[PDB]
Amino acid sequence: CPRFLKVKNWETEVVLTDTLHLKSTLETGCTEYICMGSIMHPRPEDVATKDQLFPLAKEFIDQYYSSIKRFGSKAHMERLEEVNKEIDTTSTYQLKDTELIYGAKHAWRNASRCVGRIQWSKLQVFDARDCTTAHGMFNYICNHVKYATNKGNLRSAITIFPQRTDGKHDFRVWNSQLIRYAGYKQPDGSTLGDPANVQFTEICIQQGWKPPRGRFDVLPLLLQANGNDPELFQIPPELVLEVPIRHPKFEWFKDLGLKWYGLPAVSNMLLEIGGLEFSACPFSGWYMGTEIGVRDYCDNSRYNILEEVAKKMNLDMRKTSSLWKDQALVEINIAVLYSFQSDKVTIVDHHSATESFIKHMENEYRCRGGCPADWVWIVPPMSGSITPVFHQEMLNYRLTPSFEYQPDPWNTHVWK
Amino acid sequence: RFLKVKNWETEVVLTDTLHLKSTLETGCTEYICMGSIMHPSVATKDQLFPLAKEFIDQYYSSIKRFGSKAHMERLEEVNKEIDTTSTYQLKDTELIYGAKHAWRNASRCVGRIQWSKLQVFDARDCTTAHGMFNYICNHVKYATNKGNLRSAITIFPQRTDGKHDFRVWNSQLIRYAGYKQPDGSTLGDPANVQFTEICIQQGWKPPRGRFDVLPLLLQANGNDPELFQIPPELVLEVPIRHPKFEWFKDLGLKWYGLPAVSNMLLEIGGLEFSACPFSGWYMGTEIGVRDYCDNSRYNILEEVAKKMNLDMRKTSSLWKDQALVEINIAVLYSFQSDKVTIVDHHSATESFIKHMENEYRCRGGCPADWVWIVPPMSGSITPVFHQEMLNYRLTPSFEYQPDPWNTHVWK
Ligand code: HEM
Ligand code: HEM
Ligand SMILES: Cc1cc(N)nc2cc(-c3ccc(OCc4cscn4)c(CN)c3)ccc12
Ligand SMILES: Cc1cc(N)nc2cc(-c3ccc(OCc4cscn4)c(CN)c3)ccc12
Ligand SMILES: C[C@H](O)[C@H](O)[C@H]1CNc2nc(N)[nH]c(=O)c2N1
Ligand SMILES: C[C@H](O)[C@H](O)[C@H]1CNc2nc(N)[nH]c(=O)c2N1
Ligand SMILES: [Zn+2]
Q: What are the helix (H) ranges across A315-386?
A: 324-342, 350-368, 375-378
| Cβ-based contacts of A30 with chain B (< 8 Å) | 26, 28-30, 32-33, 35
DSSP character at residue B374: S
Task: Determine, for residues A396 and B33 on separate chains, whether the beta-carbon distance falls below 8 Å.
Answer: yes
For residue A130, what are the contacts with CB-CB under 8 A and spacing of at least 6? none
Specify the CATH number for the domain of residue A232.
Answer: 3.90.440.10
Q: What distance in Å separates the CA atoms of residue A248 and residue B317, rounded to the nearest whole number?
A: 10
Query: What is the SS3 assignment for A103?
Result: helix
Query: What is the SS3 assignment for A383?
Result: coil
Task: Give how far Cα A236 sits from Cα of A82, A131, A194, A239, Å.
Answer: 43, 20, 21, 6
User: In this structure, which residue's CA is closest to atom 12 in ligand 6?
Assistant: B372
Task: Give how far Cα B59 sits from Cα of A283, B21, B117, Å.
Answer: 55, 14, 18
User: In this structure, which residue's CA is closest to atom 26 in ligand 3?
Assistant: A266
Residues B341 and B294 in one domain: yes
Residues A233 and A248 in one domain: no
Residues B101, B104, B108, B112, CA torsion sign: positive
State the DSSP H helix or E strand holding residue A89, giving kind and residue range, or none if neither: helix A74-90
Candidate from B317, B329, B371 with C-beta closest to A375: B371
Buried b (16+ CB within 10 A) or exposed e, B66-84: eeeeebeebbeebeebbee
Contacts by residues B224-232 (CB-CB < 8 Å, ≥ 24 positions apart) = B224/B408, B224/B410, B224/B411, B225/B129, B225/B167, B225/B169, B225/B404, B225/B408, B226/B129, B226/B130, B227/B199, B227/B202, B227/B203, B228/B129, B228/B133, B230/B136, B230/B137, B230/B140, B230/B173, B230/B174, B231/B137
C-alpha atoms less than 13 angstroms from C-alpha of B158 in its C-beta half-sphere: 16
Tell me, rounded to whole angstroms, the distance of Cα A74 from its chain centroid: 37
**Does the Cβ of B22 fall within 6 Å of ligand 2?**
no
Residues B157 and B21 in one domain: yes
- In this structure, are residues B374 and A291 in contact, taking their beta carbons and an 8 Å threshold? no
- In this structure, are residues B116 and B100 in contact, taking their beta carbons and an 8 Å threshold? yes
**Does the Cβ of A301 fall within 6 Å of ligand 3?**
no
- In this structure, are residues B360 and B16 in contact, taking their beta carbons and an 8 Å threshold? yes
Residues A345, A350, A355, A361, CA torsion sign: positive
Q: What distance in Å separates the CA atoms of residue A271 and residue A403, rounded to the nearest whole number?
A: 5
Task: Give how far Cα B256 sits from Cα of B45, B213, B230, B252, B347, Å.
Answer: 43, 9, 13, 14, 21
| Cβ-based contacts of A35 with chain B (< 8 Å) | 26-28, 33-35, 390-392
Which of A374, A383, A393 to mutate: most B Cβ within 10 Å? A383
Residues A203, A204, A208, A213, CA torsion sign: negative
**Ligand closest to the CA atom of residue B264:** 4
Residue B231 inside a domain? The answer is yes
Residues B29 and B119 in one domain: yes
Q: Which backbone phi and psi does B233 adopt, to 5 degrees?
A: -65, -15
Q: Which backbone phi and psi does A387 adopt, to 5 degrees?
A: -115, 150
Q: Which backbone phi and psi does A244 adopt, to 5 degrees?
A: -75, 135
Residues A254 and A206 in one domain: no
Q: What distance in Å separates the CA atoms of residue B27 and residue A40, rounded to the nearest whole number?
A: 20
Residue B188 inside a domain? The answer is yes
**Ligand closest to the CA atom of residue B117:** 2
Residue A213 inside a domain? The answer is yes
DSSP character at residue B322: H
Task: Give how far Cα A211 sits from Cα of A134, A217, A220, A303, Å.
Answer: 21, 8, 10, 19
Q: Which of B374, B375, B355 is nearest to B366 (CA)?
A: B355
Tally of residues, chain B: 411
Residue A10 inside a domain? The answer is no
Specify the CATH number for the domain of residue B54.
Answer: 3.90.340.10
Phi-psi region of A167 (alpha: psi -120 to 50; beta: other; left: phi over 0): left
Residue B390 inside a domain? The answer is no
Q: Which of A58, A43, A61, A273 is nearest to A162 (CA)?
A: A273
Residues B327 and B209 in one domain: no
Task: Determine, for residues B296 and A11 on separate chains, whether the beta-carbon distance falls below 8 Å.
Answer: yes
Candidate from A10, A32, A329 with C-beta closest to B29: A32
Tally of residues, chain A: 416
CA angle B93, B98, B101 (to 5 degrees): 125
For residue A36, what are the contacts with CB-CB under 8 A and spacing of at least 6? A28, A29, A30, A42, B33, B390
Q: Which domain holds residue A148?
A: 130-155+170-241+405-409
Residues A64 and A201 in one domain: no
Q: What distance in Å separates the CA atoms of residue A341 and residue A326, rounded to the nearest whole number?
A: 23
Within 10 A of B230 (CB to CB), how many other CB atoms are there?
18
Q: What are the helix (H) ranges across A91-233?
A: 97-109, 134-149, 198-206
C-alpha atoms less than 13 angstroms from C-alpha of A127 in its C-beta half-sphere: 11
Residues A274 and A314 in one domain: no
Query: Resolution of the experimental model in angstroms, please?
Result: 2.0
Please name every residue paired with A396 in a beta bridge, in sequence order, or none if there are none. B33
| Cβ-based contacts of A27 with chain B (< 8 Å) | 30-31
DSSP character at residue B7: B
Specify the CATH number for the domain of residue A321.
Answer: 3.90.1230.10
Q: What ranges make up the beta strands (E) of B204-290?
A: 216-219, 226-228, 237-239, 254-256, 260-261, 265-268, 271-273, 278-279, 282-283
Q: Which atom of ligand 1 is nearest to the CA of A156?
A: 27
Q: What distance in Å separates the CA atoms of residue B234 and residue A314, rounded to the nearest whole number?
A: 41
Residue A135 inside a domain? The answer is yes
Q: What distance in Å separates the CA atoms of residue A112 and residue A394, rounded to the nearest whole number?
A: 10
Residue A101 Cα to ligand 2 middle (Å)? 49
Buried b (16+ CB within 10 A) or exposed e, B106-123: bbebbbbbebeebebbbb
**Does the Cβ of B383 fall within 6 Å of ligand 4?**
no
Residue B30, annotated as binding a ligand: no
Q: Which backbone phi and psi does B156 adopt, to 5 degrees?
A: -90, 170
Residue B395 inside a domain? The answer is no
Residues A115 and A150 in one domain: no
Residues A184 and A105 in one domain: no
Q: Which atom of ligand 6 is nearest to the CA of A392?
A: 1
Residue B60, annotated as binding a ligand: no
For residue B84, what are the contacts with CB-CB under 8 A and spacing of at least 6? none
**Ligand closest to the CA atom of residue B171:** 4
Q: Which backbone phi and psi does A97 adopt, to 5 degrees?
A: -60, -40
Q: What distance in Å separates the CA atoms of residue A30 and residue A356, rounded to the nearest whole number?
A: 29
Q: Angle B69-85/B45-62 helices, nearest 10 degrees?
A: 160
Residues B135 and B71 in one domain: no
| Cβ-based contacts of B284 with chain A (< 8 Å) | 321
Residues A279 and A160 in one domain: yes
Residue B58 inside a domain? The answer is yes
Domain count, chain A: 3
DSSP character at residue A348: E
User: In this structure, which residue's CA is closest to atom 1 in ligand 4?
Assistant: B279
The single residue of B226, B267, B272, B286 carrying the catalytic annotation is B286
